[PDB]
Coordinates of C-alpha atoms in Angstrom, one line a residue:
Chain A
X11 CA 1.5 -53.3 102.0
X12 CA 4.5 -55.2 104.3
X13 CA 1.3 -57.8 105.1
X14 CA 0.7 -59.0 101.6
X15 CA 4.1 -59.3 100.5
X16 CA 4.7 -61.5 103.5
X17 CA 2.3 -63.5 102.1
X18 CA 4.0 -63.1 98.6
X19 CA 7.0 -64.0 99.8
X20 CA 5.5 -67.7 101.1
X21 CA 4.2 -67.7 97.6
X22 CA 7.7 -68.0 96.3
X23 CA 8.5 -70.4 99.2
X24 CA 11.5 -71.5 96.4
X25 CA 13.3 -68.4 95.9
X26 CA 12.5 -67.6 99.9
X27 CA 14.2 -70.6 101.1
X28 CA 17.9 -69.3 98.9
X29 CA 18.4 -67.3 101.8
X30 CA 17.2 -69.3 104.4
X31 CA 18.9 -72.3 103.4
X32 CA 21.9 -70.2 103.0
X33 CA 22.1 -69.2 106.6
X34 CA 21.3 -72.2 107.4
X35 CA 24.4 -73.9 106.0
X36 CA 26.8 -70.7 107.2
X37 CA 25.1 -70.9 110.8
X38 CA 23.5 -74.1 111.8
X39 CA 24.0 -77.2 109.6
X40 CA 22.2 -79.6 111.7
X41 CA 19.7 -80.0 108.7
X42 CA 23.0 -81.9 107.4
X43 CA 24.1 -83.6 110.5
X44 CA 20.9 -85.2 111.5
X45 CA 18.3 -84.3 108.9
X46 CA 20.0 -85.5 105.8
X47 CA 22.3 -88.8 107.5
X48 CA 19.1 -90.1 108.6
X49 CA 17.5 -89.9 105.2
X50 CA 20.4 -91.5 103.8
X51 CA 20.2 -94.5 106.3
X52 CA 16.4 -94.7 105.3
X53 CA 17.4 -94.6 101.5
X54 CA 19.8 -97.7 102.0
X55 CA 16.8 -99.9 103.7
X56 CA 14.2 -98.6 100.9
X57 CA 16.8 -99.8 98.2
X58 CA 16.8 -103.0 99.6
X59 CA 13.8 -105.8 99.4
X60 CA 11.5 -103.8 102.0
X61 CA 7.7 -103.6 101.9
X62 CA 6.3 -100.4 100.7
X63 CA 4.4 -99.1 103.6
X64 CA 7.8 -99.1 105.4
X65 CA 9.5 -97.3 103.5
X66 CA 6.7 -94.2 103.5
X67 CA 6.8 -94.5 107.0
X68 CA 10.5 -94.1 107.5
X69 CA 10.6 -91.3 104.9
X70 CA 8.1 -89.4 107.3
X71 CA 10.0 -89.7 110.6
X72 CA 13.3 -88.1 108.2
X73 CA 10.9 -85.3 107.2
X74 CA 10.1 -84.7 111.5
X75 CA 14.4 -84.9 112.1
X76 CA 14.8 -82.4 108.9
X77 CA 12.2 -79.6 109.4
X78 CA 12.9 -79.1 113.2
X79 CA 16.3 -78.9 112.1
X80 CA 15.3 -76.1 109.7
X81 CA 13.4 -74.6 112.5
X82 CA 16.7 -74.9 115.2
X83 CA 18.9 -72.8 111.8
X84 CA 16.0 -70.5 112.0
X85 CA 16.5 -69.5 115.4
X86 CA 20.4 -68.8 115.0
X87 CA 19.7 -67.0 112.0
X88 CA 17.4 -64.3 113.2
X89 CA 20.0 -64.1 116.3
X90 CA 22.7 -63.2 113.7
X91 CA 21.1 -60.5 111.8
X92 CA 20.9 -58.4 115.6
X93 CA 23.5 -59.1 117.9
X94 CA 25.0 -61.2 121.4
X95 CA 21.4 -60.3 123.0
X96 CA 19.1 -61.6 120.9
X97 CA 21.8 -64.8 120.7
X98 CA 21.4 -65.5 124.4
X99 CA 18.0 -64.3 124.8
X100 CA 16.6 -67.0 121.9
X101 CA 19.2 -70.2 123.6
X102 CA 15.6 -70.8 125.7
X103 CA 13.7 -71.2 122.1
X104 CA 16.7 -73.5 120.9
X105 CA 16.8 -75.4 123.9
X106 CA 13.5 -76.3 123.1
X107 CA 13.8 -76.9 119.5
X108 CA 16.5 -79.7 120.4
X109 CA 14.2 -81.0 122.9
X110 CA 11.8 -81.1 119.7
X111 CA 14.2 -83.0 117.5
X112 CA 15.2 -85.5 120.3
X113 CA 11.7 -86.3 121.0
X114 CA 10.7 -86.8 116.9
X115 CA 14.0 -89.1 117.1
X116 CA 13.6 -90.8 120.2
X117 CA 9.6 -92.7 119.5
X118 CA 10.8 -92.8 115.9
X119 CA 13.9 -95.2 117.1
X120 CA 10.5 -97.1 118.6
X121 CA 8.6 -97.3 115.3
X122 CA 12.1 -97.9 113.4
X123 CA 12.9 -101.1 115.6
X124 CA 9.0 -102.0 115.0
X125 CA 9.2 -101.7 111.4
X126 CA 12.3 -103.7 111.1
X127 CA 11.1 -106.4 113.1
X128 CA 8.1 -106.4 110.5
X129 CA 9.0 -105.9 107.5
X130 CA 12.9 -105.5 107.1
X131 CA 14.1 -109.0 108.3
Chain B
X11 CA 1.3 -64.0 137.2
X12 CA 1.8 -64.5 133.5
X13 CA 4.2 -67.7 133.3
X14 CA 0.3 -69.1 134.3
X15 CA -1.6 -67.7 132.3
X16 CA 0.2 -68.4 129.5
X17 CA -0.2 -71.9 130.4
X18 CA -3.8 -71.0 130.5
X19 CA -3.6 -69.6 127.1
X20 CA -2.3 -73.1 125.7
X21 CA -5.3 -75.2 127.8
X22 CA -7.9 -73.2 125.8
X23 CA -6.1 -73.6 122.4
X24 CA -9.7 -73.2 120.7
X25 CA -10.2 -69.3 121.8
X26 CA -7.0 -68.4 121.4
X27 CA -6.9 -70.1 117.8
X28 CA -9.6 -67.0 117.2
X29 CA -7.6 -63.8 116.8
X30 CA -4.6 -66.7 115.6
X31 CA -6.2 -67.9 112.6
X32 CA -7.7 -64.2 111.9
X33 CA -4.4 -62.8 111.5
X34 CA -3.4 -65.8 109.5
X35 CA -6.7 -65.0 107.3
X36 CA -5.4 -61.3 107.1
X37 CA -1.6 -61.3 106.8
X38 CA -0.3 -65.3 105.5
X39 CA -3.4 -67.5 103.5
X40 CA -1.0 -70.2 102.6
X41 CA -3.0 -72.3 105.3
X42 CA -5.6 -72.5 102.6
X43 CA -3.4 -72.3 99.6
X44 CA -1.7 -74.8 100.1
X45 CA -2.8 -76.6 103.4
X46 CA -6.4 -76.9 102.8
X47 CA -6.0 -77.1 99.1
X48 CA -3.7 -80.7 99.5
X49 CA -6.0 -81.6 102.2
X50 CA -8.6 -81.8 99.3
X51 CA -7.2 -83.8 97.1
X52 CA -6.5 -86.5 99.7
X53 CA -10.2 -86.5 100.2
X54 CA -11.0 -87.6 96.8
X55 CA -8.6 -90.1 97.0
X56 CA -10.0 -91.2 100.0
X57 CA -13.5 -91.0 98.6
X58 CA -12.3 -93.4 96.5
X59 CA -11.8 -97.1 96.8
X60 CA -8.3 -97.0 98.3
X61 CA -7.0 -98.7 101.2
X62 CA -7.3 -97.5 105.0
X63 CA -4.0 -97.3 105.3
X64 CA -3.0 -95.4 102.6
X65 CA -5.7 -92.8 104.1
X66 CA -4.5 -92.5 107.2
X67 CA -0.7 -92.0 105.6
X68 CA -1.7 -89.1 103.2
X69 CA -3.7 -87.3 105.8
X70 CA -0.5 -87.3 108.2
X71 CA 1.3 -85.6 105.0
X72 CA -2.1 -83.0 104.8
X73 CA -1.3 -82.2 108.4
X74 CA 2.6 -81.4 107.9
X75 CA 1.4 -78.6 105.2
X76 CA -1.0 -77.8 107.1
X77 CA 0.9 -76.6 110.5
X78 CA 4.3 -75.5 108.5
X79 CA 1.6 -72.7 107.1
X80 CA 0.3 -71.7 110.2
X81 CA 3.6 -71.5 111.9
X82 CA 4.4 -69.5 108.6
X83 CA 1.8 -67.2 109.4
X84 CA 2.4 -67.1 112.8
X85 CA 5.7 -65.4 111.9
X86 CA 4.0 -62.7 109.8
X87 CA 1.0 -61.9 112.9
X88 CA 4.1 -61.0 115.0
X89 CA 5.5 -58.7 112.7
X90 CA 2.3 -56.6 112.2
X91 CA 2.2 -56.2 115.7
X92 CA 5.4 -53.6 115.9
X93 CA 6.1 -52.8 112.7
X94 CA 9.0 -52.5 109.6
X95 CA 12.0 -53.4 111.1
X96 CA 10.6 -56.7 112.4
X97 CA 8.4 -57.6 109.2
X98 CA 12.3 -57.2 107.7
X99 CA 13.9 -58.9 110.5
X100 CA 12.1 -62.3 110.8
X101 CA 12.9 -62.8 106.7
X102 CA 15.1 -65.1 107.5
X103 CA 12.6 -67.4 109.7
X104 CA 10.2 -66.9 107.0
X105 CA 12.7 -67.8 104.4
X106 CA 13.5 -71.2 106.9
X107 CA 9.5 -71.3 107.0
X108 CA 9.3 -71.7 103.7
X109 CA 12.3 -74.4 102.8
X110 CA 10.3 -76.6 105.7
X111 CA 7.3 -76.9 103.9
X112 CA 9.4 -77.1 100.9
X113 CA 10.8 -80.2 102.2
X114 CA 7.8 -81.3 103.4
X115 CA 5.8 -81.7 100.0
X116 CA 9.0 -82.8 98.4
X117 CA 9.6 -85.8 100.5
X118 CA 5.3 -86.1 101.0
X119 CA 5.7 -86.5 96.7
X120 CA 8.0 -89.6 96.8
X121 CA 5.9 -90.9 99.4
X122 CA 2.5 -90.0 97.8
X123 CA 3.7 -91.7 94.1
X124 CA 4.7 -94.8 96.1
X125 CA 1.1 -94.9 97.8
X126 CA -0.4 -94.7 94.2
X127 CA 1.8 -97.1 93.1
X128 CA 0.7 -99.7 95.7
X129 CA -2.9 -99.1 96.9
X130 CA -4.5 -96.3 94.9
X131 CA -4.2 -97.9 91.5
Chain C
X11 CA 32.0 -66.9 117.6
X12 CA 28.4 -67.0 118.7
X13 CA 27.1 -68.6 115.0
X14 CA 29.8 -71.6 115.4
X15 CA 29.0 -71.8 118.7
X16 CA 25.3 -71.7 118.2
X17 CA 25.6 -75.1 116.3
X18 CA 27.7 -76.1 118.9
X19 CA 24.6 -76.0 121.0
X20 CA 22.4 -78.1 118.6
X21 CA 25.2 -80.8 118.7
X22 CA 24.4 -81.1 122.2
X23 CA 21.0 -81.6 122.2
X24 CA 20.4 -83.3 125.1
X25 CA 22.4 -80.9 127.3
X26 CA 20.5 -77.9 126.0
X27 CA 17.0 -79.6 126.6
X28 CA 17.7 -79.5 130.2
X29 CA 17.3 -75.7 130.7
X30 CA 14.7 -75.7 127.7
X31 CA 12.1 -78.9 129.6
X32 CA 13.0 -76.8 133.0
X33 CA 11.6 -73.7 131.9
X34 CA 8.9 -76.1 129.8
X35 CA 7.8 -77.7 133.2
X36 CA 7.4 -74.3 135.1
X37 CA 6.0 -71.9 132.3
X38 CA 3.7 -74.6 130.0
X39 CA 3.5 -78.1 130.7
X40 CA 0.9 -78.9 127.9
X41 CA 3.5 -81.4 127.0
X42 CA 2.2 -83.7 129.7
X43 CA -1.0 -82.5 129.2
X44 CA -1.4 -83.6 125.4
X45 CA 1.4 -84.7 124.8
X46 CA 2.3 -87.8 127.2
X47 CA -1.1 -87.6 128.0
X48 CA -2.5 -89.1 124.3
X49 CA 1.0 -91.6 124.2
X50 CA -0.2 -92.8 127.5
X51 CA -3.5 -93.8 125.4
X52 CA -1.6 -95.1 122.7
X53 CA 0.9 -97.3 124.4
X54 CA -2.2 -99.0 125.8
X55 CA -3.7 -99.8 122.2
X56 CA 0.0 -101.1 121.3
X57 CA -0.1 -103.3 124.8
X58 CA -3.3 -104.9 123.3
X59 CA -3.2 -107.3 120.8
X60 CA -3.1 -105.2 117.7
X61 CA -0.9 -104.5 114.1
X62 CA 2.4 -103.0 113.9
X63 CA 2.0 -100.7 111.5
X64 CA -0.8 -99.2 113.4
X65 CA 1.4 -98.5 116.7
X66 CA 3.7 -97.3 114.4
X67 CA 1.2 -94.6 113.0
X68 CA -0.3 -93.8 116.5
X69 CA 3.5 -92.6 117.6
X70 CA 3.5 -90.9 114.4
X71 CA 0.6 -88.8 115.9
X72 CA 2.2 -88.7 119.3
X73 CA 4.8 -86.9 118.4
X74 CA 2.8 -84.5 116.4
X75 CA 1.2 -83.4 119.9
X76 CA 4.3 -83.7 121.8
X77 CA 6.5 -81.2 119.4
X78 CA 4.4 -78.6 118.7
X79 CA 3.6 -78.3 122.4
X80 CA 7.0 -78.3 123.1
X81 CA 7.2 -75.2 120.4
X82 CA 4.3 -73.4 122.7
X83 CA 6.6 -73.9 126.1
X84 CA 9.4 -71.9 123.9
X85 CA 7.4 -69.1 122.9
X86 CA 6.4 -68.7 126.6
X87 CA 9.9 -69.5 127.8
X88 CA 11.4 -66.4 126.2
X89 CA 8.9 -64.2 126.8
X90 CA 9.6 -64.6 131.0
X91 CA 13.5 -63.9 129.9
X92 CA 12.6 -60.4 128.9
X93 CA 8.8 -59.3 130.5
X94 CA 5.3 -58.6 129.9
X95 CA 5.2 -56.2 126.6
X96 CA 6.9 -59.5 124.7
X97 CA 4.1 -61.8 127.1
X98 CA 1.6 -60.1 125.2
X99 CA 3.4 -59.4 121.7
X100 CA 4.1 -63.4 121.4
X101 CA 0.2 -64.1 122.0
X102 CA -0.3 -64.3 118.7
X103 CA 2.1 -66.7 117.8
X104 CA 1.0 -68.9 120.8
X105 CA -2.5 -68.1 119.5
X106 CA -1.3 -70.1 116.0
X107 CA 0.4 -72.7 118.2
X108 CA -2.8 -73.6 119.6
X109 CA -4.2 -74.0 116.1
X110 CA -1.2 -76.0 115.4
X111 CA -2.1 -78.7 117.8
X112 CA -5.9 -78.2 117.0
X113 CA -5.3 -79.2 113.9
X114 CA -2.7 -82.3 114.5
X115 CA -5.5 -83.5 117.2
X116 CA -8.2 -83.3 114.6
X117 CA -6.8 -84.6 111.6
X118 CA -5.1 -87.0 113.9
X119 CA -8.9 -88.1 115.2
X120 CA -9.8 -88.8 111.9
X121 CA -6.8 -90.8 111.3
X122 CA -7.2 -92.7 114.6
X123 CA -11.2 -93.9 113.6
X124 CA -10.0 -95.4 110.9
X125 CA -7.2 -97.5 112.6
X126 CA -9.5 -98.5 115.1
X127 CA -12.0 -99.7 112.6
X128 CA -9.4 -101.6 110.5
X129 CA -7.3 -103.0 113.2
X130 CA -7.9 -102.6 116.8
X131 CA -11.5 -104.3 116.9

């Protein structure tokens, strides 16, 4: 039953992700570049004397950068395991997945500038 | 003309949700697993005497489960459509699937422990 | 090498969201239809003397509309690369996207009460 093992396999989203996060890393590390530098940044302000609220609300906008960058090594990866076709055929998928990403990034910056104005000081 | 349509398609989301969510329902139930399961425990703390706020940030980390699972499923529907050699192929974009969500309740965690902290009590 | 090269193109974001928004704009422009559509409504709220932290969480659910249409313009977008046997095979990921979005909108709703009873008055 390939239908109920799928669903097995989101089960064991852990183990799954070994793999995943494995191409990831050989194929498209933007999960690093962007995903984890902005968490990082977010991590200094939250360290320093910030309110609360703030600092939930910056950890959300890292979670937007870092899953669409999981989703953007996703692409690539499937591309890999076929061939040049499916590498250029896919490019219209990851041109919208970076659309994704600068979009999460872009009204984040809004609420970021907000927030600091607020409650970082 | 199908570039229209499928525009069409995605201005009535609520019909084509139908045969969506029933091969979610069928092939990947981790909408409800963990989704729908998450959802419910915001609700109780919601129910409670908590602050508005602190509702309105933990539903925003109900939906991130929520549409990581059916994107998740999405991936599996797909699949069943042709057969073996894709449920095999997209492994990889399941396996991505699954560190996304992964990262979503991680992050969501910190987040949720810091909302006790401060407003459930 | 088409894997280095595929990161390549997630460096230049920007760049690779202008063939992505193009084939957006002429296949599925639900991104102006929810998406600017509801950040239209929400930049009014924020014009409008109201809290911070609530124009910061409206965004939030702005770009929770905005990306995942975005994601339904890419499933299209590579279908018209190939032809109609894939414009029918994705329909049921699309089908999933539009519960995507059902579900930000709804739980979004819910969210968006609540900040309107607590601070927009």
């Amino acid at each position: 039953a390939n239908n109920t093992t799928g669903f097995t396999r989101i089960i064991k989203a852990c183990g799954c992700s070994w793999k995943g996060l494995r191409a990831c890393w050989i194929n498209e590390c933007a999960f690093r570049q962007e995903g984890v530098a902005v968490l990082l940044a977010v991590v200094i302000a939250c360290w320093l004397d910030v309110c609360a609220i703030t600092r939930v609300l910056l950890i959300s906008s890292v979670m937007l950068v870092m899953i669409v960058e999981l989703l953007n090594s996703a692409i690539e990866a499937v591309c890999d395991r076929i061939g040049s076709e499916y590498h250029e055929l896919s490019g219209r998928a990851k041109d919208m997945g970076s659309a994704a990403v600068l979009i999460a990034i872009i009204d984040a910056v809004i609420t970021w500038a907000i927030l600091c104005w607020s409650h970082f000081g």
